[PDB]
Amino acid sequence: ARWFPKTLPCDVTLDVSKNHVIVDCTDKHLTEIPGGIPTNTTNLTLTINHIPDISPASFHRLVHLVEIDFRCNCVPIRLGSKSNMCPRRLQIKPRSFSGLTYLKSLYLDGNQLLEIPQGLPPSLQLLSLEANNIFSIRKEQLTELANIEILYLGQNCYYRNPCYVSYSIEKDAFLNLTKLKVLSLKDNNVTTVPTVLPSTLTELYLYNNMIAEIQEDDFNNLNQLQILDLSGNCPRCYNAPFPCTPCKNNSPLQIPVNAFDALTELKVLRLHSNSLQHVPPRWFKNINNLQELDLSQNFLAKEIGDAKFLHFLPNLIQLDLSFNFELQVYRASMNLSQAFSSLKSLKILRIRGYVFKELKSFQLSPLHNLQNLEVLDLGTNFIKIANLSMFKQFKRLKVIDLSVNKISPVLEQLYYFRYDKYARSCSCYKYGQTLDLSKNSIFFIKSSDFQHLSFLKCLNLSGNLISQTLNGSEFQPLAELRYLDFSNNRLDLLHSTAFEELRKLEVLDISSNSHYFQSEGITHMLNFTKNLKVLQKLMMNDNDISSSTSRTMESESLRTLEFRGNHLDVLWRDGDNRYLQLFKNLLKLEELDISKNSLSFLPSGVFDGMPPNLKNLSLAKNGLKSFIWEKLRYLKNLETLDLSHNQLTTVPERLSNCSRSLKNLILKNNQIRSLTKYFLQDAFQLRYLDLSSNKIQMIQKTSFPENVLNNLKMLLLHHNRFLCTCDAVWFVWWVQHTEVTIPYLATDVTCVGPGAHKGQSVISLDLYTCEL
Amino acid sequence: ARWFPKTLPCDVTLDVSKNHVIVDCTDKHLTEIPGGIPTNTTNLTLTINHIPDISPASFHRLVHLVEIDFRCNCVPIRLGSKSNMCPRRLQIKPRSFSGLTYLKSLYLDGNQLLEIPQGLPPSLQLLSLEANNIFSIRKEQLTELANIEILYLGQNCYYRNPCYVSYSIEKDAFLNLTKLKVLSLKDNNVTTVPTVLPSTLTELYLYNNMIAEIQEDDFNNLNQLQILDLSGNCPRCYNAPFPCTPCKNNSPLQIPVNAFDALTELKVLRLHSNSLQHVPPRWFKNINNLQELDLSQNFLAKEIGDAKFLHFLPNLIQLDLSFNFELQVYRASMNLSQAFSSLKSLKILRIRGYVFKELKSFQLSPLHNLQNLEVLDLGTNFIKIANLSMFKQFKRLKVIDLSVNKISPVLEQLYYFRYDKYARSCSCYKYGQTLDLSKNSIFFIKSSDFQHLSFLKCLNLSGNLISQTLNGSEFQPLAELRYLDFSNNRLDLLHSTAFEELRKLEVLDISSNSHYFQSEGITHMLNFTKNLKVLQKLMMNDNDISSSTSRTMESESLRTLEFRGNHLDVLWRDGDNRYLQLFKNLLKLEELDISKNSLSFLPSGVFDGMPPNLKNLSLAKNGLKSFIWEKLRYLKNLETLDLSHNQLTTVPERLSNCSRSLKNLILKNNQIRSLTKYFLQDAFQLRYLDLSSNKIQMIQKTSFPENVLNNLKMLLLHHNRFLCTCDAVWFVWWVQHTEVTIPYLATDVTCVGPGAHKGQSVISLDLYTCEL
Ligand SMILES: CCOc1nc(N)c2nc(-c3cncc(F)c3)n(Cc3ccc(CN4C[C@@H]5C[C@H]4CN5C)cc3)c2n1
Ligand SMILES: CCOc1nc(N)c2nc(-c3cncc(F)c3)n(Cc3ccc(CN4C[C@@H]5C[C@H]4CN5C)cc3)c2n1
Ligand SMILES: *[C@@H]1O[C@H](CO)[C@@H](O[C@@H]2O[C@H](CO)[C@@H](O)[C@H](O)[C@H]2NC(C)=O)[C@H](O)[C@H]1NC(C)=O
Ligand SMILES: *[C@@H]1O[C@H](CO)[C@@H](O[C@@H]2O[C@H](CO)[C@@H](O)[C@H](O)[C@H]2NC(C)=O)[C@H](O)[C@H]1NC(C)=O
Ligand SMILES: *[C@@H]1O[C@H](CO)[C@@H](O)[C@H](O)[C@H]1NC(C)=O
Ligand SMILES: *[C@@H]1O[C@H](CO)[C@@H](O)[C@H](O)[C@H]1NC(C)=O
Ligand SMILES: *[C@@H]1O[C@H](CO)[C@@H](O)[C@H](O)[C@H]1NC(C)=O
Ligand SMILES: *[C@@H]1O[C@H](CO)[C@@H](O)[C@H](O)[C@H]1NC(C)=O
Ligand SMILES: *[C@@H]1O[C@H](CO)[C@@H](O)[C@H](O)[C@H]1NC(C)=O
Ligand SMILES: *[C@@H]1O[C@H](CO)[C@@H](O)[C@H](O)[C@H]1NC(C)=O
Ligand SMILES: *[C@@H]1O[C@H](CO)[C@@H](O)[C@H](O)[C@H]1NC(C)=O
């Protein structure tokens, strides 16, 4: 169907609309730029290869290049692979870029460049050189960047990439860059705010450096600036998960009361981890459009009880005061000043790590009339006592986050403590008001705990110590709850009435409640689903279920059931019939996940026991060694069948005879060593076939008739054991000229033999000697 | 060093003392008995193969045979492989066994035999036919077994192997078996005790059948009988994890009060799961040597409060009353009759599954002066309340097991519910007094909870809900405790004084306490070990540890540290120096397990940081892709290094030059494709080398100097990718003629090629074509 196979080990994409021809050679194990990149090419990406040099030959004919992404061909030793270290830094010849008169972006991050490449074209707007070894910026070396708008110079001198000296910036070095809009000098061992900066700046990033003092003429001319980040200068180093040296005498970063007076257009000010003990109100008189303020990881515990500066922040949308506890203090309560009530625009308020024992309703009084307050995040505070009913006054909020506390009767997992949360590399909220009580110490629950909280749409009890026999009496106020996360508890299904009070329950997660399922003789009423008339999705993963008092689960509403990580192999012990219909009366079940169930075989009758409308069935990761494909005829609405990561050695003789409906067949990571002679014959609804990571040596046209292959949206065959003899002539030819999508022709569709062709990719194979 | 290689795919062993030449071909995928079995063979095992028939040729010359183990060559389909089902039942030709004049044991279990094989020689003493299809026993078919003493006929008719009729035993079928001592007819659909049985019987197994009544004279002549098992006739079927049919009206097994009057010699009486509601004292009038009584899984709850039959059991050693609770009752307390006090020889009392809310001290008073009580087992009782100090009156006991209860302020896992716990296939007690509180609902602890338990040597709190900051005040009475299992809790190491109260603690398990290590910003004092001056072994597996407030763990006593399943990869982030000596001041550490720590490379300084007496180091299952072997010289006492299940591709050029001490090198399950030219040269300390499951094609003699091979206790080479060309001539000759121990030369030391030799064993390879 193609006259000319593409040998090029890169994805080539066309945007005729944006007149962009995108060549992506990310991570293709290249040691030189490939030959034959399309002449018209605009976007060329070579990230994560081992190309040792750039020279005028490199970009060649590619005079239409508007972006070169040549990152991480020589990553700093502590940041890159230690099994494939880069031996000598990237070498950039003179004259390598001067010819590309249209070049608008040059990414050279992570190549151990010692100096800024020069001879760059006047079209250049973005220059990225993060994670190199450039720690002296001289103004003459920036002449070439007259038109530059975004300059990334960070991470050239920090603990993961040390330069052992201070960062040096010549006076006024960036001033004649009259179009510079974003300047990043983060993670650089900078000692002073470089002056004078061009007034064009909208974004200035100076965080995680060694700046101890702000002079007040540092930001005199930054009247266009919108983002200022001074975080991590004089860091608060307690439990730092990276090497951290605070400023001497525990000094804060010193910012004169008026250093921000020119920042008329400042929208976000990040002063995270500056060891601040006060926030002088005078900082903020001339910014009255500030919307985002980060004051986390300082020493502002008492300042939180005062905070006169809040009165000057009426347009503030986000305010972060997390981790300001003073070391070794366990406050009894939270003293929030009334000044918080003047934060009329406030949508996001986060105060993690204040560390106090009791939260009572009055201490949140300053927030009672913040009419757009959407998120109150009080996590990681070791609160032991809280009347949950106090949150009736916050029916308005979208998320009340008490995660990680000690109560008893989405941000990254390393977020507040990560060194550079913005470092570049080479959930039930949608249902409505959410109260997150996850990772707490609630050992018992009763309906009263939730009085005056009827409005809740999603409730998170994940990771508590709830080990009680739910009989439908524990959650009665929560008449609108649609989502209950009950995972990582010890649910005791003694009563088939568990959870039935939640009459609008749509999603129930009782995954990882294996405690009681792991001990013999305990009763488990699995048919409790009969009572949740609205339930749509039930997750009971990793429960170790191997016995059930009830022989059938019943639901008229349930569409998806996650039953992964249990012991259906024991429930379906060969000879025991009693549970072969456990799922039959889930009448609108469309998706069943029973991967990870040790099902080395499926008893006869499992398929007949499946509910009538099943579309998507996962039997992955079961150690399946045999499979009676013919019993798929019982699965009359089956469209996706996932047999990945098993021990299957054969495919059916006639897939067409096993199902008239199957669309997506996933057979990756099995032991298949060859296909049956007429495998796919007349399988006209087959659309997706993953056979990757098997042991296939040959594929003849008998098994892959082209009138079924050619309607495949995708066809995965990488990581097999292909034998590229003259007997393979049709498969090699078909792989070379098909329009069907086959991922990884470059890196993993390969001959294992014979000898001559070993490790050679099938797409590059010349089999002319088979035709003499 | 051998002139004649052993090609036979079976382990051949010699016992010169007992004149046993044992040939073990268990599970060698045999389709016929291998050729060349030694003529002297006495013990031949062919279990789990696919040998389709036995005929006189089978053993033709093996006339010294004393035992043939020919089990599971045709397992019943519901019991056996579905991927390699047996197609046709085993066929035994006439006269196949009559020649083996010394045959004393014949195992033919699991071959779908239709009839008792005939022609057996009169030497035969043991005959096993479990899991066949022989369900009609006729007196004529047993004449041949005149000298028989042990007869296994069970599992020929039950739910995993159905015969669809009742078992038939001809009247007096076994009477003329004048030497029969063991008769087993378990799992057979037997309906009546077969009569008359020979009076030689010492053991009779009739369990899991359909016997509803014992006749008064069924055991009249069994005056030599020692073990009677009538369990599972009229089963109690509640929560049965197998198909279970009770007797009509849930009636008990009916046993006349005088049925045991001849069993003067009975030591073991098993009446498990017989739906008994009373135990008539009259049963035990003439049994005065009973030592073991199993009364579990009945309806004897009320009887436990009465139990006049105990007065007739002064020699009883074990009594099991487990799982006798009445359905739908949650008794408030346990009523044990005062008659328990007449059980003076009692060593083991098990009453699981009585189901009561409170255990108070007065209720165990019938046991206070049982002077040989060693084990009291009260697990799986849903006890909600128990004052632990009551066990001061049981200092004499070895194990107090309150496991799997609901207390708050070694047996099989399926044991009382297993169908046939004796079905045949084809820990801190040693420290002293043990109180097992594992799998309970103890969320908070304090010193008084253990008042008057100063004697305890081991405490199991595994799997409770303890989520508190231990500061060394919680265990203060436990002055003699040597072992604390604290696994599966939520340990909070805020204080480095945790556990210091346990001043004689030798083994501490805090594995699987990952909860608080999973949230950022929490303080974890890993140096709490300085305070335990006798601690020998610390397990902290699977805690997900990735951050630590203390930089060094300190101990003067610790020998073993299990640190598996954590995130040393994060702690030792490349560029972060601070934790590279975390184990350095554990001065007597001899064993470190830091497997499963995501260590894809080891930062420089890890080996230098290791404590000075480290002998045994596991870095298994880390995704290790590179390894600087030379740094092993920092481990001056290294003897065992485990690098198994990683991604290593090369071995060092000279292992001897990397370590002067290394004895055991485990490199299994890596990506090694070849050995260095002088790999093992002068490695005079090497004793054990595992190179199995790699990708090795060739091994030359330079790499395996024979003055090093001859000091190997073992050398594992199976499952590589050996290439049996003429270039392999030395390795094929050496494997065939060496005396070094190599497991699986028969089964998994195999050629992948070239062509002719694929799948062929190296030991069988004839390379004369390489010498013409
Ligand atoms: C024996 C194996 O079955 C099993 N399986 C479990 N999963 C389970 N859980 C608990 C449990 C215990 N205590 C606190 C909890 F939160 C849970 N129990 C004990 C129990 C036994 C019977 C009854 C029946 N009710 C008591 C009665 C009769 C009915 C109403 N009357 C007051 C209630 C509880 C369990 N027993
Ligand atoms: C977030 C910082 O790190 C961290 N790490 C943990 N692991 C942790 N655990 C708890 C905890 C709380 N309450 C119940 C529990 F069972 C555990 N807290 C809160 C806390 C913080 C400080 C102090 C120290 N105070 C100063 C003293 C001694 C004590 C009282 N005196 C005034 C005590 C408790 C924790 N805080
Ligand atoms: C940041 O700058 C400081 C000071 O310029 C560097 O510290 C010097 O490092 C060398 C080599 O370790 C020492 O001999 C000097 O005494 C250090 N000077 C001071 C003042 O400490 C430091 O290495 C730089 N940091 C990084 C990550 O490169
Ligand atoms: C044990 O014996 C009973 C009868 O003694 C067998 O039950 C018969 O099975 C056939 C086929 O399943 C039925 O058509 C009969 O109605 C059954 N008879 C009775 C009285 O139930 C039973 O199959 C045997 N059990 C096993 C495991 O083989
Ligand atoms: C291609 O490069 C241009 C110029 O840097 C950029 O604006 C555009 O978004 C890129 N498009 C793609 C698909 O990479
Ligand atoms: C509930 O909290 C847990 C634990 O923090 C989290 O993993 C999970 O995603 C939350 N549930 C939802 C539905 O977001
Ligand atoms: C269910 O059990 C709870 C205790 O968890 C109890 O308070 C309640 O009365 C019970 N509900 C019913 C309907 O029996
Ligand atoms: C579930 O099945 C059990 C049978 O053991 C029955 O007692 C109970 O009423 C059933 N409950 C529901 C909700 O179907
Ligand atoms: C060999 O067979 C005899 C006869 O049954 C048996 O007593 C002995 O234990 C067997 N020895 C071994 C090592 O299998
Ligand atoms: C438990 O009994 C002991 C006597 O051994 C007594 O000292 C203690 O007060 C009792 N504790 C409780 C909670 O009843
Ligand atoms: C403690 O109990 C648990 C669970 O019952 C068990 O796995 C563990 O082996 C026990 N600990 C010891 C030291 O035997």
Ligand SMILES: *[C@@H]1O[C@H](CO)[C@@H](O)[C@H](O)[C@H]1NC(C)=O
């Ligand atoms: C240790 O903490 C416990 C609470 O777990 C408290 O009762 C006790 O007073 C504390 N003792 C010391 C010495 O800090």
Ligand SMILES: *[C@@H]1O[C@H](CO)[C@@H](O)[C@H](O)[C@H]1NC(C)=O
């Ligand atoms: C553990 O190390 C910490 C370091 O912060 C120290 O404060 C504490 O006293 C140490 N504890 C012990 C028992 O050595």
Ligand SMILES: *[C@@H]1O[C@H](CO)[C@@H](O)[C@H](O)[C@H]1NC(C)=O
């Ligand atoms: C080394 O340690 C492992 C446990 O991690 C143990 O299985 C093995 O026997 C030890 N080897 C020696 C020689 O002590």
Ligand SMILES: *[C@@H]1O[C@H](CO)[C@@H](O)[C@H](O)[C@H]1NC(C)=O
């Ligand atoms: C390794 O070999 C070199 C060269 O013989 C030698 O100088 C060095 O001492 C050796 N190291 C060890 C630890 O044997």
